[PDB]
Amino acid sequence: KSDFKFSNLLGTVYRQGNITFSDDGKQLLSPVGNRVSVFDLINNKSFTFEYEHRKNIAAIDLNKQGTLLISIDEDGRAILVNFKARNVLHHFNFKEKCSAVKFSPDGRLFALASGRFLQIWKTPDVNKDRQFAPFVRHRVHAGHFQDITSLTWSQDSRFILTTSKDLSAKIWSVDSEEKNLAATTFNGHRDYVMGAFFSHDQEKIYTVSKDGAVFVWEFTKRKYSWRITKKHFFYANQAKVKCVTFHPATRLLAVGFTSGEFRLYDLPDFTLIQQLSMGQNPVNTVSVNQTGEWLAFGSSKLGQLLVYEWQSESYILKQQGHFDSTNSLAYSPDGSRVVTASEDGKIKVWDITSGFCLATFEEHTSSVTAVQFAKRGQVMFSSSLDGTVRAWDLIRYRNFRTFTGTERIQFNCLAVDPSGEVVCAGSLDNFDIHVWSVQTGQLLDALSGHEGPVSCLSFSQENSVLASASWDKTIRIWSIFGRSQQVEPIEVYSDVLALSMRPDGKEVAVSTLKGQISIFNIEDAKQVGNIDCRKDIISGRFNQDRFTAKNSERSKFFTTIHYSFDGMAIVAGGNNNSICLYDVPNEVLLKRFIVSRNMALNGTLEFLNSKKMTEAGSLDLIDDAGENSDLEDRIDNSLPGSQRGGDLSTRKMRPEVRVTSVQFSPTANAFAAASTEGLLIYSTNDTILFDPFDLDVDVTPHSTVEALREKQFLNALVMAFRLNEEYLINKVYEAIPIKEIPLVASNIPAIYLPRILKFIGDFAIESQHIEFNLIWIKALLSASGGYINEHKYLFSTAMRSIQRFIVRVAKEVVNTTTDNKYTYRFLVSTDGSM
């Protein structure tokens, strides 16, 4: 139950740093803020590493065995991770801002550009145990005078070619005996040298600078001493070079500028292969595949990530995330994708497994405040600050309905009917609730009676009663349908934000500004029970404020709560960096999750380092923005009293950490939280955590495979259920023959029914045994499908996971074979003559 682990981070495909591919370039590793996301682009899936830097990460590299990663943040705290085990091996603090880190091609050394020193360390093994100090320093070279901007290893891991802000580039041999082969420095650029690469044969050296010159250096005579043989210029006038890379085997130089334009050249002849634009923001990262066929570009201002094949002029993916600006989320009615309503005015539909956005919708001209699904994933409603609720067909991708009021107000929350005739929406400046029909477009009613801004709306999913709750300390229950026009006001102790509604519509849980979650019986309007949550809330201290995190009143309450689908738990989040989940019978905290440890966000640390507090102000409120290398980030265009507007440049404070929406998954035992870093997805998995169910001493994996070998199949299945071990359940499940699936499925005891149903769901989504899984589903639904119907909310997430398998792989296969049957019948039954 309560044993959730950080699974995934939807949204935010790129934040800051360098993109890396794999060696067999199937996955790409993308630095999201202080996590690292890895997107597998062929097996369409994605994961995020569990570990967490304390600042935004700035460098990524993993060796070409694929076996370990090293990630450095923006003040040099490196973290070495085992890439296959997904566990962190070492934490190593380099003392200053490291610009690049690279492994050797032969994997055994890595080097990094810390300040103006190139330091080469040698890679610890993945097979060795963790030591106190696994890194053994090879050397540290200091020949540059200003900071080093780039590394490049040679093809043999023998020389390393580094580029600096100082207007040179240098070549260093790895070992001391070849010191005479590599002692030269490469002058001649007017600006920062952005890259320096070898050719395939390591005879030519290309050095690309910031102003736009690429120099070809050759070991020629005018003795032989590395002349410059040709200077080529990009002649991009206002823009200048932001990122350079070179695939030496295909002779492909890829260059991204500060204007979104990137050009890619065939280098020693300098012929423009292609030139096209990501956008208007600068291209912060270019990275290239090992075969040189894919180019991954990252722009850091809009958080966007392309990977683009330049032969077939086509985007493998062109994605863009949302940092800090995400107002709402909603799971699809099968937990396959999450719809995100974001403050720059748009809807984005993110697949969960493959961590990418399928569709985006921009018809709101202001910050979209709420999304909500209806008509079982066919329609989706959203309300924004531009005055409109509007409806979206997720088949034809059309905004087919737009609902406005008559009073020019901005809508902050909505609620749809189950039987989606009526949409409903509430504002924070109008005190009314606006009731629109969906079939016609008209304003059906304006419900009145709150004396404070209607903070939250929800329709009961079963008996269809409306529950609104507002800042006049009052939850209110409206019987709209059928001649009633009945209003029942329940008062409560303080002003309400985030009501939520049970899946059976019996009870309603409200979150209050005191810090509590009260739970009320709807039909008999009396309080069933409350949780007191303001003392298990992690409220950090901001940098600007002059009052401690203990005495602060900023975030000791939950602005979003949500029921579990068995009705037994509540997940909750707010403007604090803890999300907490409880079980509502016992009103006790099951688990509290720290949503960020990034010190680049504001409300993370409860106690701020007193070294940073000086005789006039803290040292993190000092703006060091004019110490910057160029005008576009020396610029301050932040109009003064702006909080929660748009365009993070226009607010002047650090982005605070907050969760704006929490939701449970409708199909598989997880929840998504819309934080500022992205859509944090926390999920359990049954592979770990031995948690048996009434086993005795004679219940053993050995006993289960003896019962399987002796072919008591029902006894082996219930022994594996009492073990609750996923591999054993899978082994017995596949070993039962087709001849006696229905006998076993009829003799399964009723306590092991949700276990076998949720196992069949989470197995059959990705397993290939489609007819076996459908035989088991047919046998279970036929043998025990009355117990399910009279215990709906137990199998409410195990049955939604099963019809996530039938309509999403099995029905697609059945559609293909049906079309083949009918095209056969046409192609042989009719007349093709001339």
């Binding site: 006039a616 000092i622 923005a625 004019g626 110490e627």
Partner: protein
């Protein structure tokens, strides 16, 4: 941050600027400081004007002018991004150059911007004053020093000093 140092033209007063914000005007040879002000944006340089009684500091963008005890007298709306200030004491002129390619002479007594000159050579990497004839030697990213006067809108002389910048 790193402290840009400046002395008054008789050696009585010292004016230090931290890179972060810390500007202190002081009598370094007694133990008397007369301005310690923490201007929390990145300051770059400062100079005295005709006295310890007024000093000009080059801040994040705008050049500011402070009195003896540190109250702000002026925020100069011109002098957009100074990195180098120098006072011409016989002419009463505050001379200003920086990341813009412009050189600005500002009369401190009247209050009047005397000259704006396009360097036309990008940001001004170095700057010095001839104490003999008050012409300004600016060093650019060409390796070129140019000698300037506030009368001619072109440099009086352009010398090719170095390679790279100056």
């Amino acid at each position: 941050g790193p402290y840009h140092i400046k002395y008054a033209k008789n050696g009585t007063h010292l004016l230090i600027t931290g890179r972060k914000g810390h500007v202190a005007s002081m009598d370094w040879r007694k133990g008397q400081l007369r301005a310690e002000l923490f201007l929390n944006e990145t300051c770059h340089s400062a100079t005295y004007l005709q006295n310890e009684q007024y000093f000009a500091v080059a801040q994040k963008k705008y050049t500011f002018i402070y009195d003896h005890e540190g109250t702000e007298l002026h925020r100069l709306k011109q002098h957009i991004e100074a990195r180098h200030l120098d006072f011409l004491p016989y002419h009463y002129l505050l001379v200003t150059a920086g990341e813009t390619g412009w050189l600005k002479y500002h009369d401190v007594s009247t209050g009047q911007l005397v000259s704006e000159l396009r360097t036309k050579a990008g940001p001004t990497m170095a700057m010095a004053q001839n104490p003999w004839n008050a012409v300004m030697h600016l060093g650019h990213s060409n390796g070129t020093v140019s000698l300037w006067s506030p009368s001619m809108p072109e440099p009086l002389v352009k010398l090719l000093s170095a390679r790279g910048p100056v």
